[PDB]
């Protein structure tokens, strides 16, 4: 017959191998598929979905409905931020649990832009200004409203538009970051003006926060760390 | 019908679809799907069941599928001393649309 020469790698089973294989049911007429709504062709389609950030992971707030709400109140006008969110989507406990983070935990490398979307859930009457800042990687996060204003920022008007979609850029020395450890930036929200309200309307509102990958986002080198 | 050429009457051949609890009275059966078979005129009655299933295929073991059921519409009339005890036979067959799959031989000793 055809003289062959069995090479190294013969009779080994590599779990990453991709060969043909004999069908155990070769005469069996498979149930044909139907057009179900919602076919996912890629996992990033699930990371491109605005999911809600848990900001308060304290002992009480966590694992409830309150861990997501950031409460704006009326107290002494301290320059410190309402929230400061580090942009370690995998190595930040807050973004780690989002859908994005759940998909990033399955991978080693990632690259792309994130879009954060804060959402005022207060009154139609209430008015005011927040300042949504973005410190780039390497920078030590802004501690006062002035430091934040001078850098990149968006003066969000609570009175006019009820959301604010700031998009982070892709800044990294490598073509890809890691999902574990080291910076990546900081979103941070300050009061520009203490929130005004009309009559006996409550002076304690809430802002929600969403995150999602952008169309430029990509991951690689699958790494499942799931076990018991 | 394997009775007399003389005998006359009406049977009602009903088909309850799957999920339905079978008809217990002639009225309940008539209101649903049915065929008033005339014993006097035509000696057979070919009712075809349809293919109703949630899946594209049923199982051969366990859960419904319907009920054929035959009632008297009229007690069978006969002429003179002709016997008043007739017989009906019943046949079944797949149709051209029938198909099976996933062979499962359970034959053993």
């Amino acid at each position: 017959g055809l003289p062959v020469m069995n090479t190294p790698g013969s009779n080994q089973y590599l779990t990453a191998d991709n060969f043909q294989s004999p069908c155990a049911l070769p005469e069996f007429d498979v149930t044909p598929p139907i057009d179900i709504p919602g076919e996912v062709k890629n996992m990033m389609e699930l990371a491109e979905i605005d999911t809600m950030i848990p900001f308060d992971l304290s002992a009480t707030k966590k694992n409830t409905m309150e861990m997501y709400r950031v409460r704006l109140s009326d107290k002494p006008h301290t320059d410190d931020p309402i929230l400061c969110l580090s942009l370690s989507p995998a190595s930040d406990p807050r973004l780690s649990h989002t859908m994005l983070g759940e998909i990033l935990n399955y991978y080693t490398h990632w690259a792309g832009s994130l879009k954060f979307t804060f959402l005022f859930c207060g009154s139609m009457m209430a008015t005011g200004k927040l300042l949504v800042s973005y410190a780039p990687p390497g920078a030590d996060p802004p501690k006062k409203r002035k430091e934040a204003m001078l850098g990149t920022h968006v003066i969000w008007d609570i009175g006019l538009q009820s959301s604010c979609t700031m998009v982070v850029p892709w800044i990294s020395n490598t073509t890809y970051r890691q999902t574990i450890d080291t910076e990546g930036g900081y979103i941070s929200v300050f009061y520009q003006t203490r929130i005004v309200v009309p009559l006996s309307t409550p002076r304690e509102m809430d802002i929600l926060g969403f995150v999602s990958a952008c169309n430029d986002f990509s991951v690689r080198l699958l790494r499942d760390t799931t076990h018991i | 019908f394997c009775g007399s050429m003389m005998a006359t009457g009406k049977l009602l051949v009903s088909y309850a679809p799957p999920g339905a609890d079978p008809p217990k009275k002639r009225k309940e059966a008539m209101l649903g799907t049915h065929v008033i078979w005339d014993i006097g005129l035509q000696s057979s009655c070919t009712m075809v069941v349809p293919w109703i299933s949630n899946t594209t295929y049923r199982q051969t073991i366990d859960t419904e599928g319907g009920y054929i059921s035959v009632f008297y519409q009229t007690r069978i009339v006969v002429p003179l001393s002709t016997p008043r005890e007739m017989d009906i036979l019943g046949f079944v067959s797949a149709c051209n649309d029938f198909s099976v799959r996933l062979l499962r031989d359970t034959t053993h000793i």
Binding site: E27, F28, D29 | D97, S99, V100, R101, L102, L103
Partner: peptide, 7 residues
């Protein structure tokens, strides 16, 4: 409809 496995 398919009658291959009953061939």
């Amino acid at each position: 409809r398919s009658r291959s496995e009953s061939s």
